[PDB]
Amino acid sequence: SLVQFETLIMKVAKKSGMQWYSNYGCYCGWGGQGRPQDATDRCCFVHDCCYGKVTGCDPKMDVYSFSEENGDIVCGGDDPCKKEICECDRAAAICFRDNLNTYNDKKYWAFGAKNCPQEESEPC
Numbered sequence: 001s002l003v004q005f006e007t008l009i010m011k012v013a014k015k016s017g018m019q020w021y022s023n024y025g026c027y028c029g030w031g032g033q034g035r036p037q038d039a040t041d042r043c044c045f046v047h048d049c050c051y052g053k054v055t056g057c058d059p060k061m062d063v064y065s066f067s068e069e070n071g072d073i074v075c076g077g078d079d080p081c082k083k084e085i086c087e088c089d090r091a092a093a094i095c096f097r098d099n100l101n102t103y104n105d106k107k108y109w110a111f112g113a114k115n116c117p118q119e120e121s122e123p124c
Contacts, residue, residue, distance in 0.1 A: 001063050005089040008066075008073060012093035013100070021096065025108045026116035034116030039102050043095035049124035050088035057081035059088065066090070 009017035025041030026034040027048055036042035051059040057079070064086040065077040073093070075086035 002060055004063065004086075005092070008089050008093040009096060012073065012090075013097040015096070015100075017096075020103070020105070023110055024105065025111050032116070033113070033118050034120045035122055037108055037111065037115075038104065039099035040096060041108065043092055043099060045122065046095065047088060047092035050091065051085075052124060054081065054084055054088070057085060059085045 006017045009015060009021070015021075021028045021040070021044065023029045025037040025044070026032050027036055027041050028044035032045060032048055036045040062082055062085060064075065064079075064082040066073055066075050066086055068074065073090045075083045075090060077083055077086075
């Protein structure tokens with residue numbers, strides 16, 4: 001679920017997804033259009049694409065299970081579809097952590113739609 005995604009971001013990236021990634025660039029936040037603007041933005045683009053490929057369950061409300069072992073986030077459960085949702089969120093959380101070096105809210109927060117033309121929308 002999205003609440004779990006927020007949890008993973010805070011666990012892995014040690015940041016609040018709501019407060020740092022809810023309206024960044026063209027893709028960080030609900031939906032998206034145009035070109036991913038930077039590393040962080042592409043992380044979001046990929047996450048959106050990942051959710052878009054999940055069939056059989058709901059990435060927004062379904063709850064998945066995970067544990068922490070060998071210093072990582074391990075997605076589990078007996079439901080392959082829910083495990084897939086967890087993998088999407090896990091990958092995005094790590095991506096945000098790994099690209100904190102270039103995170104730039106001053107340039108990319110509330111970027112604007114004109115800067116994210118529908119004609120430049122990169123396909124998954």
